[PDB]
Symmetry: C3
Subunit: 616 residues, 3 copies
Amino acid sequence: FKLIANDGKADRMIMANDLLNDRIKSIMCLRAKQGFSDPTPTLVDIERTHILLINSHYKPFAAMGYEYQKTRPNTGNPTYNSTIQFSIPQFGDFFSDMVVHVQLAATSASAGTVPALPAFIGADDQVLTSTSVVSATENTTSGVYTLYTQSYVNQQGTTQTVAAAATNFVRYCEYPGLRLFKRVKFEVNGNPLDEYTALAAIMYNKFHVPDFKLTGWKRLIGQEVPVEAASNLVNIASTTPWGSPIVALSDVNGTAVTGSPVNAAITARKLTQVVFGAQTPKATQEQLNMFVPLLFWFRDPRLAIASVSIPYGQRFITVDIEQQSNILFTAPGNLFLQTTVETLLTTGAGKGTATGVLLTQYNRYTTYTPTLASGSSIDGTQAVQNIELYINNIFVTPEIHDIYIKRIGFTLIRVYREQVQREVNAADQVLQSQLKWPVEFIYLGLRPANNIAAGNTYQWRDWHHLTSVTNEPVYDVSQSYARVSIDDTVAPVGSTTFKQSASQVMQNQYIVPVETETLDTVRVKAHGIELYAQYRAQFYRDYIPWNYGSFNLVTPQDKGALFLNFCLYPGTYQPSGHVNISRAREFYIEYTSSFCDSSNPCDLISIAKCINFLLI
Amino acid sequence: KLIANDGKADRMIMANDLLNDRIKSIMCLRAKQGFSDPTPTLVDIERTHILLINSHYKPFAAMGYEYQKTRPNTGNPTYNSTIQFSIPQFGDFFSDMVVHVQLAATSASAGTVPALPAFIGADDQVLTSTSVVSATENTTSGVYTLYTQSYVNQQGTTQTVAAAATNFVRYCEYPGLRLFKRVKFEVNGNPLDEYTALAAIMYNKFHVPDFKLTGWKRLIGQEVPVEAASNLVNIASTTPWGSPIVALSDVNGTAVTGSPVNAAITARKLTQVVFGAQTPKATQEQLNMFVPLLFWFRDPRLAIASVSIPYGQRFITVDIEQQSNILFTAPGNLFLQTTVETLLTTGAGKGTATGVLLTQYNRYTTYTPTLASGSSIDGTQAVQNIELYINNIFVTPEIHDIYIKRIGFTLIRVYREQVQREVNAADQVLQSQLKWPVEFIYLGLRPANNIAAGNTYQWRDWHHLTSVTNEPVYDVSQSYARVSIDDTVAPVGSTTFKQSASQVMQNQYIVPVETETLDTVRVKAHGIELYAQYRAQFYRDYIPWNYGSFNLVTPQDKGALFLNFCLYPGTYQPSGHVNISRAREFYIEYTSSFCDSSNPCDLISIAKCINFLLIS
Amino acid sequence: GKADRMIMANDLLNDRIKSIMCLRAKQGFSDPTPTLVDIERTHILLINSHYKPFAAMGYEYQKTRPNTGNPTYNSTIQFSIPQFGDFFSDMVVHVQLAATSASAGTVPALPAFIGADDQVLTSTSVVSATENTTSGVYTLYTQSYVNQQGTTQTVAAAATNFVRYCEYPGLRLFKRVKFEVNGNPLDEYTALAAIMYNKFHVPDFKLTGWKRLIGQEVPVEAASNLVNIASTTPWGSPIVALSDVNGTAVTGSPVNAAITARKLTQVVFGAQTPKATQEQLNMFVPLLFWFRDPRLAIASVSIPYGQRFITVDIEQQSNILFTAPGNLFLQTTVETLLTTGAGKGTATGVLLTQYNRYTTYTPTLASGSSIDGTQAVQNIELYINNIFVTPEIHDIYIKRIGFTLIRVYREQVQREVNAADQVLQSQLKWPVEFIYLGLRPANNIAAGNTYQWRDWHHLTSVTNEPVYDVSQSYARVSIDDTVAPVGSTTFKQSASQVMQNQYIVPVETETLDTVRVKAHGIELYAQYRAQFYRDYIPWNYGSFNLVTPQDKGALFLNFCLYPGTYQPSGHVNISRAREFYIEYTSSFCDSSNPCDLISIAKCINFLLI
């Protein structure tokens, strides 16, 4: 390998090595001519035209150091559903990133009871005890007698008695640290300098937490992380779990049989994910510790705020705490409704009834439904045991401090501007009344009001979703077949003395959350001129987040998270585009919906990140 | 305390004594020169030191951007045709481009239940419209083996041979990437840059990091996994097992191996489901894709001046793939049930249909999803809409005339593709497509069977760069039954104590096992070894791991290889290349343990080259 | 206006243009049009295809064998760094371990009896029973060995274990990795450093390559058959879409599926999965030195050939390769027989009404079947990126750069038995950017830990929680065609519970509750919960250079603003680092659970040319 540095027009345009050699020849000639001791050029001489890919240079930084400080609230002992205020203490010359430690006590539901059994299903042979409800359907035409049985059991199968003791489990809503803070306000002189709601926090959750930060984020805000679990070998090369009668069969013409398993060719095991954190129902949710970070522009160290610039007299962080009934929820515990259907096929007298004779075919179907206990609810006395605000304080030399205060003048900042418009219309043009500055981009969703309804038993999960979520069962079913001869003098093949039994039992059940999009098209108009034409929803949810922002902008998992973009580099401090303030006044977001109507009201959530300034 | 000066280390890193000397100096000068405020500027400070707190930014020359969509000039779009778009006149510059493709809802044509398979056993053969039955006697063992096959639906209902049955339909695994057979950007009828689907899958493997992946999938029609939670599988302090087996101890008090104990955590299982375009469905709903055009000017810095490429002769030209390479037939609600029953009788005629005293009965059952006969894709499926979206950029008239006058030229990156079919285990392949400096090359050896119509897995293998075989993974439901048929005989030890067992296929998984087609790669140019003969994993794993930062993904595909010649692949600033001279006589040598005459493979080679584009 | 004036300052720009064109016209330039550099003195151009030419440079990799002869486990291997390029940069080690199997062994002896009655011992099964004449339940215990197909294995017959590699074997094989210069370690690190990198510095756009480089298996996505088919159901008709006598849908009666869906599962079949034969393992273990950065490649003339070496100490095979249960399983069967007539609850009781079977399978080691100690290190080679520059620039660079800033590892591991302690960091004597911290239980690396192959790199106490997939089964059969079955004891009951699969959940118990950091009478970090160092700090700092770790015990004590960048951005001063205390709280570590406090610091040093 030799390094060729001048090979035609392409190398002269990319490396320009002959101009570089002419610069070096010429620069050594002048250094010598002028009386310099060392004629060889300086590294910045070369870097006037060329870039050095091998370069160890760095700049010394003006001396600095930082330290975190904890602070308790001014507002007494913390509770749910209250406003908590923090003073920004006088410590560092600057303060930067902030995070709040939240501690919620271990908690359990109150003792309740087993509820009443369901109603009868069949019209005949109805018996209701304290442990089961039995009914039947007769069918004297076919000879099939169908017997329904429902009962309450625990996980081990032991039947529970109606009105006996039973306790529900408890669980947290998904991303509890994000729902806990209804509003977060940075306060100076009584006036909000910036504030955001849980709506802005979940938008951050959907758009700005890439994978290399995701496990820490979920742990910071109390969301359970899946744990990987490995099975036994399911495949062992050169063998099979199947009984040999069905293994490696060939038909009478020598063709390998379709549906006949053959030995495995690899040795493998299965991976499955389990969760057992705050969102998983438990008899006792243990103490929940969260570190909810505050999503203000000055998290950036370059944008730390001068302590002398904001009077200690009234600089506050203020956090409105959510109600407990929106954070902690009941859910079925160790109690399951067992539904059982049995079919009896008789041929003799009384066939199709409880008195039929000669039973040829028995079938059984059994599902299990996790059931809530009655009178068992969340402990309304659950203590908020601790809440403390952490502030990164930054310190600089007195010389640099003086120069810095006297010379920057102003700093560019980003603020949140929210608006929530209730909608029953399949199409509307909503004036964006709350927008008043240059807007870089707008988070946009159309969240169905039902996602936050107390009557929605999936509110713990649906609350941060921006679509309509329907719940889709996927059943794991175990299938049995059993055959038995009851006459030891008669060949069973072809005989009714060769009985038949089969059963289908629910092994498990998953719930698939199917998202239904609420937005079809979105149009952005200002003074009657289109900022965005009427484009399909997937353009703002998939394309714009894919194309712009690099590792600062995440293509969101939520099918309802839309990104109205107006700059070229949405993540970066350096400005790169916005919508002017005269247009920011008369600003319309027009949507079309296949979902929203009077029967399904929705909230059009628009959250804008706007450019503002701070003088010192 | 901020320390700022601990000996050698702190001067080299922070140089604070120097900084304070500079401050004293500047303050004395500005006073002596007659400045009223002698405090240094922030600019003075930064000539030697970096300020870790600095809100400085630069104002940007005013610019905005807005998208505009246009319809093709070539009439109504269809499969297997050429679509051409004009790049309309609108902005001073045009940049990122995406194309909305809208394929209609579709479903397969009505077919019939196929014929039953051939007999398996030689004895007792009976063929009926609903089942095929054959047997194998064994009068030595007493085991009578009965084979029965039939067609059923998901509910298990028998289906008559030649009865109506309809296949499901699915899209291939990245329909947006396969659909655009070729994508050209023509100026004056000549291709300035063009790429094929092979370039798109290379982008899919190397340049879609996970924080862009979900959106990327939704843009090009790849279904996205949905997380699904199950009921509780572990409840702390209890167990699903029956109590006779729980927490056993042997005669010596030691806990029994294989005896379950109560759980110690409360947990549920997470599982992923898909139900999008690649899942077989009765109806595949309307497919709306937004396929990004992977040209260099997608970078906003590198937008194309509209004055430089005149309207009326600039075009985006897309060649559309055939429908049969995009939309596919799959089994629907029809399954081959393959049942094997073994009857162990011990009385007279044992091992025969006339055996008397049945002791043990075993049943084994698999289900195989089966295609219906004469049920294929709807060839009339319409391309309902295709539209090119171009981001237009507007700048001030003042900067526009300045920029076009002074910028001179712009760097561009072009695709240079060569495909060579091979039947050799080893070979030297001249790269006749390389005319310009080469930055890096995407390399794969894709078996021809991956894109062949006879491969029933083409819908999935088409983008893979290895040989892919299908290993089954079975979930089996094992049952046992035991029944005494005589109430006067003690069951234990009595042939009246029957035995019955069944093995039922609960589900089946297909594991795609990758067999690598490349063993080593050597790169040789003008008689110079650029890369010595190295194992493939050096190019697939180490080079993508070490280079490119978040611009280079370590590919999942075991056959995706990255030949690198620059230090920062993905950046605009050039960082190394292969000169034109060596690019003009460039050989890729490979060795392969797979490619022979029975397994032809395509040595796909796609280079990214540096070229230049002049103004105006 | 007002807001745009400060962001774009277009009025000032238009005047600078108008101003510049006037001056150039006065001074007699042919072209009054301003330069782009003129514009960039005040404004930034968002559309700009400018670039600088780079001083010519190419690179090539070179491959070298050791100086120490043929490689073996548990030895020291040294590579020279040959004279080739003007600079050398990133380094990677190709390791090739031969295909291997366990030795032939035997089916172990069967378990002891369980019940006190009716004990029977053959070479294929153990049987024992527990009577109950009060209830009439006769319980029958059966244990035996089978293979995966269920064929009964005979005691003392042949059986071979399987072989598996420990997790991340490329990170454990390199016990010590070392860049020696003029006889002295310039930088060195152990496997503890490498696993910290595994936890903090491998983002997921690099993760599949990283795992393939160091011998960690990659999960493979696998799709199933349709489990939901819209407008139909797997359930048989009698239980679908039921309504009660009031017209209300029955709770627990399945309905037709609304979507068509299929499952995705993940499987592994790489070096961590037990196999009859592990095929030859090929790893490319990257060497994690500071000079992997091309900007910081070491100049050849400054550290010439002959006084520069890479020295690697190889782990013992016993901590890399492990035996595992192969195709051998302990089947544990319990059968209950409820009889009501004479002799009820014993083996002679008549009138059997209810049968139940419960069956689990436990993978079982074979006796006398161990790993192959002859297993060869078949090849080991060091790859070095060499960089070439023109003679003119190289002469200038070697005369002008002066020095380069470097980063080096400083490790201390102190065994602890205290629930709380304040531990002096004796290994820090240079500025400190950040420290990786963990309290690893000593049993995670213990040979007596069957799960050592998995726990060795974990920084918490890992416990194993089983998760079972149980197949439930029911059977009824009428044994008298002249008696109506409903309500009759001639209508028999039968049920079985068979283990379909078992998963093992690694539950991590944290060993660190709080961490406080002191240095020379200064609190650098007040006593905070571990989750502040594990979760908040890696989340807020480092951008794509700092991954929030999955290991619940990995902590990041940060002392800089931009960890992972070359430009310095904060450090613990030399005076404080020289008297440095890390105080911890533990709810796990005590006399019975020894733990190792692992502190690995990244320190700043400098290198002269």
